[model samples]
Target: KVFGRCELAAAMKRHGLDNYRGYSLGNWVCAAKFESNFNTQATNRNTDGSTDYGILQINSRWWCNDGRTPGSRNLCNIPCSALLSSDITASVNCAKKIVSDGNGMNAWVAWRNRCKGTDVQAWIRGCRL
Candidate 1:
């Protein structure tokens, strides 16, 4: 699904991403905006042969098992394809696991490079918390 900014905000909030583990809603939204443009079917292939999937662009190497990445831990125990589903449950759940594993919202370089230290509050400006 191609989620609008407010639409995605509502979904993430419902899934407990707002201020989750100390990261604000705008932080997550900012990361996702750069990672997948809020599109559920987004995917990116890395040179290492690992792939990033879905709206959150979850990695196959350590999070989801795509049945391809070498030594994939599948920490989320979910198929990478599931991350691409229109329903972002799998993606969100895996992302929660990722951040909880000590990375916080810094797991995605896109977030660090684009969202971090930036004015992410604008990401939810008119969204009405």
Candidate 2:
């Protein structure tokens, strides 16, 4: 819980999380909404026993290391606990790397299921940033 929706939106804007490659702030916001409700401390144990980390719900299978999870590709080369931090600089950078790997926001299942083709602008409304 570092942020609510509006706070997350504003922070993302301030940090230029919106300007990564071809993605939008709305795309990130919408994915954050469904992935972790904007909570930086969010973590989920997947059905396959991998974990999702941070606001973007990055997977342990490829993005981060939890110490307990073995065989992580560690593409972002970061500790999973870092993703839970309030700063979010690491998470934001890692998310951009994930997208650069060619999945776009489709890296988040929440993006495909809830954000794609939807009125994603709503995710950033009233942030006044």
Candidate 3:
């Protein structure tokens, strides 16, 4: 599994630095660890540890119960995960909605560092080497 490193690199390459704006692939890669523990098979519980699954930790039950199939819901014309599985695209894209800023790049970066523990201020401010 590419997990954090490769996946993040691919995303940045696809979106490019201009789209990333104040964020770098490293920054986003750090963010993914925070959000999903870098576990592509991650899952989260709703206060009771009952529902949720997959890398993005989406709530499968609620998502699946909606009026669309597993791979067919249009949140910004994208299908949402009704049941959490190995839907990498859906997870990342759904996270894109959660952040909803900086041209969807915000969501991507936000999730990329949702649980970021390091100080990224300097890096975000263009202090790269």
Candidate 4:
């Protein structure tokens, strides 16, 4: 696991993710919590044969290549494994690019089904950032 909620929030803020493109740090924190519980090594296979990657659970269907899937767009220009490491620079950069691509956090089902419309502020309650 790379971060606790507080720790992740502080880092995200430092990375200018606190409110990047109008998305809240709370939203990122909550989404990451549900998606992977802050584990960078986390990966989950979807029933459709695609997989999700890293802390934010980015899907291989469009964002990255997992080798199992050929012809992946690899939009972030990074291997899916890059997202599985504790060095979240690549993952964060990819995530920001994803948000900029127009879907926002809504691209992550965890965010849409769980974090959205909830009391997200608690995700960063004591980060001190």
List runs of model 2 lying over 4 Å from the truth: none
> Model 3, range 23-61, lDDT digits (tens) per residue?
545555555555566566655555543344444455433
| Better-scoring candidate (lDDT), 1 or 2 | 1
Q: For candidate 1, report its TM-score.
A: 0.96
Q: Which residue pairs does candidate 3 place in steric collision?
A: 31-112, 31-113, 32-112, 63-82, 64-82
Measured by lDDT, the strongest candidate is: 1
- What's the CA RMSD of model 1 in angstroms? 0.9
Q: What overall lDDT, based on C-alpha atoms, would model 2 receive against the true structure? A: 0.85
Pairing residues by index, what is the TM-score of model 2?
0.93
Q: TM-score: which is higher, 2 or 3?
A: 2
**What is the C-alpha lDDT profile of model 4 across 66-100, one tens digit per residue?**
88875557889888999998877877888998889
lDDT, model 1, position 12: 90
Model 4 is weakest, by summed lDDT over 10 consecutive residues, at: 65-74
- In order, the Cα lDDT scores of the candidates are 0.89, 0.85, 0.46, 0.86
Better of 1 and 3 by lDDT: 1
lDDT of 4: 0.86
> Tens digits of per-residue lDDT for model 1 on 1-129?
899998888889988888888888899899889999999999999988999999889999899888889977888998899988878788888888889988788898999999998988899889966
lDDT over C-alpha atoms for residue 109 of model 1: 91
**In model 2, what is the error at residue 106, expressed in angstroms?**
0.5
Clash list (residue pairs), candidate 4: none
